[PDB]
Design a protein around this ligand. Structure first.
Ligand code: A1ACC
Ligand code: A1ACC
Ligand code: CL
Ligand code: CL
Lengths: 123, 4, 123, 4
């Protein structure tokens, strides 16, 4: 018999992104080659099969620094991290291959799906 | 607010 | 020029609620009289003007336990905490006064609004 | 996916 506030989930995510911009309560640094990205472990797990696996691990859950595979592109990661916190994906011709490879590694199935459909349309 |  | 995934914010919130149920990465206990509620500080700040004020405070941000005013009803808090994590509000004739008073204390303006409209319709 |  509950009632539901339509915009609640979007409002929560907007405030989680504000916390990220101000660096409030971030508890992990993701290292992608020469670049560093601060984030909230809970948001990363909620968006990614890879981070969900990492942060449920009894040892890795307590790490303050996570290093990704050297093949991962920092811009691709940045675009996906922005997507996690906003629902918006900056998908461009110049970055689509890097975004798709990063989404496959991060296990972000909906992003992989769309990257596949956008590449198929161009061939 | 809505009836879900 | 971004594209947007409509269900992303709802999917994030569903996974944050799964983390709460499994007690994963919860970093605070909210004490309401004889009852205890574990939660994520980031979600509490994102939903409530009161918790946003508390957890941006340079001293209170590091507390593992927060005690609410003894006038706050545990069921009212429980209903609002469930709302924070799901967008669903279990508003009933028997609990509406407690929910509205708790929402005013927690500074959850949209919940206060609706409680006001539901009471006005019954008078 | 949509054009926001
Ligand atoms: N507790 C918890 C919890 C926190 N996060 N999380 C999940 N996170 C996830 C796992 C896999 C994938 C994605 C997100 C996006 C995608 O494409 N795959 C799943 C579950 Cl079943 N549970 C949880
Ligand atoms: N950074 C950050 C950040 C984290 N949380 N948060 C806000 N949380 C909030 C503040 C007031 C109210 C509500 C939520 C619901 C309501 O009725 N009032 C606001 C801002 Cl402006 N910023 C942030
Ligand atoms: Cl995804
Ligand atoms: Cl609200």
């Amino acid at each position: 018999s509950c009632i539901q506030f339509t915009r609640h989930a979007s409002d929560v995510l907007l405030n989680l992104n504000r916390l990220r911009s101000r660096d409030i309560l971030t508890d992990v640094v993701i290292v992608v080659s020469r670049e560093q990205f601060r984030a909230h472990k809970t948001v990363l797990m909620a968006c990614s099969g890879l981070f969900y696996s990492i942060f449920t691990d009894q040892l890795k859950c307590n790490l303050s620094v996570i290093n990704l595979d050297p093949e991962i592109n920092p811009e691709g990661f940045c675009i996906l991290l922005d997507f996690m916190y906003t629902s918006r994906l900056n998908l461009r011709e110049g970055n689509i291959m890097a975004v798709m490879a990063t989404a496959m590694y991060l296990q972000m199935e909906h992003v992989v799906d769309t990257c596949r459909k956008f590449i198929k349309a161009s061939e | 607010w809505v009836i879900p």
